[model samples]
Target: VWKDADTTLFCASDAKAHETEVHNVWATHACVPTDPNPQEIHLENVTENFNMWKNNMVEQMQEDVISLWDQSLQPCVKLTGGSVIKQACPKISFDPIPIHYCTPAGYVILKCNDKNFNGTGPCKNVSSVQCTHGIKPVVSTQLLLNGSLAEEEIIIRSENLTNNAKTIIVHLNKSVEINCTRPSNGDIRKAYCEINGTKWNKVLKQVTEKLKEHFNNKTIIFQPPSGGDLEITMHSFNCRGEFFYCNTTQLFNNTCINGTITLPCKIKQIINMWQGTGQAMYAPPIDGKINCVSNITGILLTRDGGANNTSNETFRPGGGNIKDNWRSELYKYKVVQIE
Candidate 1:
């Protein structure tokens, strides 16, 4: 039996309150830090029972990228999605090829020669993607970029990624919530699938290595495009029959669930949930509507989960194996959009 958070049991101040401290977390304790996440994105919610679905949120902190080039565009390197493009590429042009020719479709044609384009001879310093088009070996960087989200590869919760999924990376110390959804007609499964753990790690390792070969600096933090569950810690727990613990700011590898969650200081409210019956719970860019917290009472003595959002009450206390300790629950911090 995992422990549940029992701290929201006390209140903070009466004067100069609400500005720094608020009781929005634990109604009983009503004393959670009002300061939001680094991005002012996460909030505290202590009443909800669970998160029906899981969204993978991770902290990119100082991680960044220098050159995210891919061979997809052929003959030229293309900067796919991942951080903002600080400088598209160098302004100089090669013989015959103008700086304009260097950036086609933003594909940015490099001095593609059979040697350099095929990736070997002179185009060493500015090379990450090799071309099969067999162009000349004139050589020079065509598309060079610098930004954050320097992770080599993206890791999702499901066995396969869906179109509904997108990789969100937060700059500085801001956190991001990446989509960890399944297809409409899909079934729920573990984040550590037998066929994936080994493969995913391998690819993840590949990117981390390649990232070093390219960026090779301490300035740019290396953050991947995927997200993960909380760090393994005993800092949180609940007894209302819903004590599934772990957090989102760090990485957890217990083989439990693989998704994002928050701590008391970060959650808008702590609710209980079953699992991903599908449908994502939240998105960035704060809003007022409740996507997961349907009813305030949903977090009530949730021995199994749900209600008041109806308590499975004989009008009261639930216990024993009927513990409300949610086996699969998560949290998402709310943000202030306006006032």
Candidate 2:
């Protein structure tokens, strides 16, 4: 599926006066603000989009890790000891363009430039240009040569759906292997595919938010140029499996959610009643926030020749918590065999 997420804006307050005026127009949707003393327009999508994009990009890197040194036994696949494999640019599945004909010749502008807003205003109020690059943006990677085969393997990349071809065909003389991947290193990169076409990363940085959620914790962090201020909602349950799904969101006063915040007075009134003490504030933390914040990642660990299993083991910070200590507990069992 072609998954797409875009940057969006939310109206901050109805009393702000600029609520309906047009400034930045890319906002997907809007809602009432819910801050304690709300006065700003908060965008819910920024963080969620960024996080999911980051995760997808990281997963893309896994595509490069075809196999470890001793994992493969093929003579032709003598583990290159290197991770990257550049191959020839293959024929992509997107069509270059199908509509070569000129637009139904439109009438030329009789007069153009009007500084005022009125019905008789000059043609300066022209409709937007229909041919912007972003309207039909396309991506193609450089041709790479494959070193594993005697007949030099090649791979071409593109995310253009309008291209003349359909499936990215892989031709082989024998039983050749094919894989899709993103790059690795400390570089921040952009992707051509829709999955992470917005903010794909080229670096391998510490993954704290998801890791924390996986481990049933809530200490979110952002490390320097690599880990920017990013927070994600973690979903967990007492269910039967390690179930979870998360998205990126912008870090506002420090949370993410959908829609915007509009009415704050009514919100505060509700909070006062919920506490019954009339001292606690009840406004939402922020707009667009999904109340639940994380999920548990494990179920049980098993020992060899044993039928018993322990609680699921999630990522730990190499320190102590109520859960198992990763550094020490890891040695007690063979983790790889479980996968």
Candidate 3:
């Protein structure tokens, strides 16, 4: 039994106005915000029976409070969907091979015997082997990339490398590939024959370790070719959800719903609803739309009643509950939908 300041009553003889006027005044007073909770103001004055007519409006406010509580506490929850995010780029490495058999020129044709050399020995860097072309031991790189994806392994090999080749490196940042193209210059260098390919697993491992981190849940294969044919594949670590780019310019990411929800409902008679929490005197949002208030609960009494847009009712002395008052009964703020 919540209380309000407006519900205070006076004796009939103490009345400074007419009986009808008293009914109207008391009814208005009872309807006013007596305290923080308006619905608690029981129409004690109505028990006098002289104010029987005003009792109808008193009940309306009570229902307002009840409805408000239901809506506020049981609002439907929704999940927001988003795009995919990725991690950073991995670091690149360059391994050096042993050198041998120097030419008259500064550039030396390192022999196959060099630890870095992939083929057989005799071709090994031999002290006795004489240099023909100032450039010798032609070195090239190739890649044999493999992965568990729908597609097969991808192969990449560099053409015959010549001149004073300094460094060889491959880079994969996020999902984009950065290949360092061969250079051209004054040194008498032999043109490359082919490029190398790297296994998708190896490349991704190096990249994931180098990059920051991403939200992608699924695994994606990435393989780069090496200087020589090496049959091997690579895999990306726990990359899930969304991933952005290094430049912070472009990006690659994906989003999906992780779960689902189901709502159970049934039809019930709503003579009036108590809007304890959800009830309000006015509709929110600057748009000023009446339907927006439908979410709330209360004695939303209407005046110029209509099937849809109904104006608030002007309380009359004899005005009763207006039985079957569809305006206030269903959609006081707007039309009611039976869904």
Candidate 4:
């Protein structure tokens, strides 16, 4: 028996059969109905009970269901008619229907009419579709140094890779002693590899085998013809900064005088290469309404006005507050009809 805040008592007892517990859950009952003197409690119910205890049970059940959904089913389970909260999983599409319950066999039961919908649905009965989990590979690297018997493990996170899916291995910090084929993606002259602040390229000119190691004590040995053909490959290390170049360029051809022309200047990634001073050289001379003006940089190109009309005006390459247009320039040209 439990008395709520309103002083209304509710009663529940476990069912027993042949002196043994039958159902594990308790059988709930109204306290007034089970009282020895039913009239005494029934009179109080007409004045005070007034469904207070019944309404409280409904609110309690609602809160409990919400708690069960948030803690138990929300984190790992994904519903078909709902949005996905997991970051690694891909988006799912389902037929328009309300999903009320889900079976552990990996199918969501629809509350609508007689329709058995699987992962893909119009609510039509279909076969089950298997679910695929996303894969985020663990990346790592190692550097085989000179005269080192053992190598230390260097674990790199997925965020550090240029592309998380493509993995590239690099060997650096010592002379090349191993005879291995170059990657097919590389060039014949040199194979290039870049690390955090350093670049390594295969040394095509000089390749020597100064150090050698044998596996175990002894094994069967066979020798080919002496010096029939020999290949040696080494890697050259460089600390020089990366080079800068344009990756995307757009031209706005033909504009009336005082009309606006937007030029796109998108640069590739290469830091520390934009140092020193340079001058802007145009295809034809900067004349007439054709002028180049400084504009703010963002995702889409924009223009405020025509080019600078000042006499003897020259555009400085590196002289600007904004860094986006420092290595690049946004030009606007106003033309006159000579014909």
Candidate 5:
């Protein structure tokens, strides 16, 4: 029958039966059986049995059949079934420049050029220069004075951005003064005003003498010593006493006195009006004497001799008329002069 199986495969008369046998062979040898039986027995050697069937089946199939076999079997062996669908990629176009150039106030300036993007990208860095020496226009300690008719002059040597020394012109306004405290020591000593670490008193004296000479010559042109700085210190002492006293309030009464009057003995309070009577009133026991005076005049008789007196006038001390309500409070007083 096995020898006839080969003959039946080539015979068209047994094509149906040959097709059924091919199906049976595939069912027995495929990794997954086309026709499965519940009662079929499994082998004890799993890997060996699976390899034996797969190898024999692959050898029997052509290349195209084997490719189909690979496609079918690949999904069973792998964790996931890969797809032919393509994945999408995100696109972006953003260019930024770095800010490296900065100002003295800690602000940065950035300029962007798209053309330079390929060479060094859109970013360019900045650098700074370091100073190795001290800056110019340096000044020394200044001592100010108070309440003196003196002058202060400071000679300054400064440089431009190119490091060249330049002359500075200073204009002084008349009667300008600065108030300052006195030094701790009582005695004023000969302290030399140093300029660039040397005694400059002689230089100041020379400048002063030159200024005096020019003034005396009536041609007041005092040229500053060429190419050197001048520093003058003016020391002054204030004569005003530290303790100051002022009389903020003064007594107003019809009285006169001489000599000194103390602050404490002065009026603490005074009454100038009482009960809106329009009468100027004063507190009792006034310190000074009332220097009140009055004049009385009688009209002269006319030359016609008929005793034609026109009018008469009389004045009493204590200038104004005493109010009727205050007449009971008055008393006769005596005036004594102390010479």
Candidate 6:
């Protein structure tokens, strides 16, 4: 059976947006004003330029991946004393496009000759590109190659599901490893992800709100970049030896029910990424970002025989979110070629 924590945005009910928190001086972009005396630039043109920026990064990113994968450059699988022990990391490749594309905020564009908004508009001359290379986007080295291998099935609380539900469980499974995972504990200098098409990790840093005008045509136009957020509502798990199920204490009908639950986890793992380095000619002066997420779920087994139904029987058990905006301070800036 597929034994892994079902990580998904599809389970949006469990992936609710929590508060965005800043950790130690997390600042956003220092966007520049539109070029002086430049004519009004169409939002479409800005979008095209944005797309071009992404394409260039896609190509540049492929090189970075290939360079890391190159055993000659950095061997992923190494034995004691630098000897080669190759079980080999799976073939890693990025799709031409991203799974979820977004930015940090929206842009309020001012007419080129008139300065009202704090953003970079189309330009008549001088294209400036800044690629913060050298201080590699911090990558973690410790790798938990295997998932929690055990027998487990769980289900989440549902306040919105049909009331005709019973034996609520956060997850439901027979037997296998645990899927909860922890971010690397500051180990490596490369980026990697599961190549199962759906699992390959993606990183992106778009021009922030200052460039959001490029997406005004679409309602959720520029998807705002956000801090990694994880949410767990009331959940149920097996109580007996794989024989029965139960739920955590949750408030329903203005009264608390079920066993007193516990959420003893505190999570926050952040790292710098290179995706933010790409920008259009008239883009803002910015560096990369450190944004990745992690999930760690534990076992559940409470006693006192109480059975009957699914429904929110609900109350949020734990967690807010951690966010940080980082632009590298070490990399020397260079202009990447854009036609």
- Best candidate, lDDT-wise? 6
How far off is residue 65 in model 6, in Å? Answer: 3.7
Model 2: number of clashes?
41
Q: Over the stretch 240-338, how does candidate 6's per-residue lDDT look in tens digits? A: 001011122211112311322222222211211222321111111112221222221211111112212321122122211100001111111112221
Better of 3 and 4 by lDDT: 3
| Per-model TM-score on C-alpha atoms | 0.16, 0.14, 0.12, 0.14, 0.12, 0.19
Cα-based RMSD of the predictions, in order?
28.0, 29.3, 42.2, 34.4, 56.8, 22.1
**Cα lDDT listed for each candidate:** 0.18, 0.18, 0.19, 0.18, 0.18, 0.19
lDDT for predicted candidate 4 compared with the true structure: 0.18
How much is the lDDT of residue 88 in candidate 1?
Answer: 29
Report the C-alpha lDDT of model 1 over 217-311, residue by residue, as the tens digit.
21212221132222112112211111222222222222322223322212212222112111111111122211111001111110111222331
Best-performing candidate as measured by TM-score:
6
Model 2 bad stretches (over 4 Å): 1-102, 106-134, 137-246, 250-339
- Residue 318 of model 2: what lDDT? 14
* Candidate 1 vs 2: which has more TM-score: 1
lDDT of 2 by residue, 1-339 (tens): 112222221222222333331211111122232234412222232211111112222222122112210121112111133433233322111211111001111311011112221111123322211111111001111100121111222111111212322111111112211112122222212111111211112000122333233335444332211221111121111011111111112211123213322111111111111101122111122222112111111111111111124333211111011111111111111100000
Span of ten consecutive residues with least summed lDDT in model 2: 135-144
- 4 versus 6: better lDDT goes to: 6
Error of 4 at 323 (Å): 59
